[PDB]
Amino acid sequence: TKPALHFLDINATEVKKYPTAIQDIIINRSFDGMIIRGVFPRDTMEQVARCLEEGNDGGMKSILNKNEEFGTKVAQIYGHAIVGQSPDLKDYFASSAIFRQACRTMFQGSPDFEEQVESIFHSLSGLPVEIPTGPEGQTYTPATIRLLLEGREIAVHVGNDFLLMPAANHLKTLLDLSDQLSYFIPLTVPEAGGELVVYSLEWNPQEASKYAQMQEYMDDVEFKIKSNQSQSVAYAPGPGDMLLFNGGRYYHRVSEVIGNSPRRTIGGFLAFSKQRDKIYYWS
C-alpha cells in the first residue's frame, strides 16, 4: 500500500470510545482528523444564527470585522482572530472579553458552547482543557465566528505558519512545539460550495526558503493542490457537526459559497501544553 490521509466519521455519543484521539492525530500521526456528528442540536444552531441575523446577539455585532478592504478570499469575522495581531494583544484581549459574554448569552446554556466543546476535547484526550490567559490574566477567546457570503471563500493556508508570527510570542511560552489542530462547527450551511478541503501537502519552511518571495512559493502551492499529485479530502458538515483535523500540518481551504444562505462557522485551534498534561483551545 501507499500512505493515505485517514479520517474517522463518528457520532458525538461515541467520543468516549476514542480517549487518545488527540494524541493519535498530533503525536503518533496514525490518522489526520475526524467528523463528529451532532455535537450541538440543530435547534440550538438555528437559534444562535437567528440572534446574529436579527441583532439580539448579546453584543456580538459590536466586534464584527467586515474586512471590507481585503478581497473575496477572506471571510468576515466576529471577534479578532489572533493570527496577524500585534504582539502586545491589547485589541485582541478586549474583543475576547466581549466574545465570551455574547456567546454565552446566545447559547442560553442549552447547551453552553464552552462547556460542550470542553467536554468533547476531554473525552478525546483524558486531559484537562482550558482557554489560555495572558501575562496579566487577560482571557484569550475560545473561538471566533466566520461569516462567508455568496462569492466569498477562505484561501488555502496552513496552521503552523502561526508559529512564525509575532502574535504567537506569548502562547509559545505555554504550548508544546507539536502540531496544532483545527476545530469548527457550522451554525448555518450554504446552498452549494462552502466545502472544507484538506490536502496532503504539508507545512514545510525548508521548501518555502527555495523562493525569493513568499508570493512565488504560494503560486506553486496553488499549482500543486490542483494536480493529480497531492491527495485531497472534502467535507461539508451539517449544522451542529464538528470537524477536528490536523490543520497545523496540512494545507486546507474553504471553497466559494454559492447561493443566498451564508456559511456561518464557530471555531478555533487546540494544542498541548509544554508537558503534554493539558489541552489549550483558542482562536
Residues annotated within a binding site for succinate: 146, 263, 265
DSSP per-residue codes, 157-206 = E-GGGGGGSGGGTTGGGTB-SSPPEEEEEEEE--SEE--EEEEEEE--HH
For Ca ion, give the closer residue by CB, 254 or 279: 254
Question: What is the closest distance, in whole angstroms, from the C-beta atom of residue 132 to Ni ion in the complex?
Answer: 18
Nearest to 233 by CA among 268, 256, 200, 186: 200
78 CA to centre of own chain: 13
Considering beta carbons, is residue 142 or 247 the nearer one to Ni ion?
Answer: 247
User: Residue positions in the annotated binding site for Fe(2+)?
Assistant: 157, 252
Question: Known binding site: residues?
Answer: 146, 157, 182, 191, 195, 232, 252, 260, 263, 265
Stretch that binds Ni ion, among 81-89, 188-196, 243-251, 254-262 (CB under 5 A): 243-251
When asked if residue 88 is in the footprint of Ni ion (CB under 5 A), the reply is no
Cα–Cα distance measured from residue 218 to residue 153, given in angstroms and rounded to the nearest whole number: 17
User: Cα separation of 267 and 147, whole Å?
Assistant: 12
Q: Which one of Ni ion, Ca ion, none is in contact with 28 (Cβ closer than 5 to 8 A by kind)?
A: none
Name the residue among 168, 179, 235 with its Cα closest to residue 202.
Answer: 179
Residue 248, interface with Ni ion (CB under 5 A)? no
Q: Report the nearest approach of Ni ion to the CB of residue 6 (Å).
A: 19
Largest CA distance in the chain: 54
Site string for Ni ion, 208-227 (x = CB under 5 A): -----------x--------
Residue 107 cell numbers, joined: 447559547
Residues of this chain that bind Ca ion (CB under 5 A) = 259-260
Interaction of residue 247 with Ni ion, rule CB under 5 A: yes
The reply to whether 91 sits near Ni ion by the rule CB under 5 A is no
- DSSP H helices in the chain: 21-26, 42-54, 90-107, 113-123, 205-208, 214-225
Nearest residue to Ca ion, using CB?
A: 260
Q: Which amino acid is at 121?
A: F
Choose the contact partner of 247 out of Ca ion, Ni ion, none; CB within 5 to 8 A by kind. Ni ion
Kindly list the residues in this chain that would bind Ni ion in the complex (CB under 5 A): 219, 247
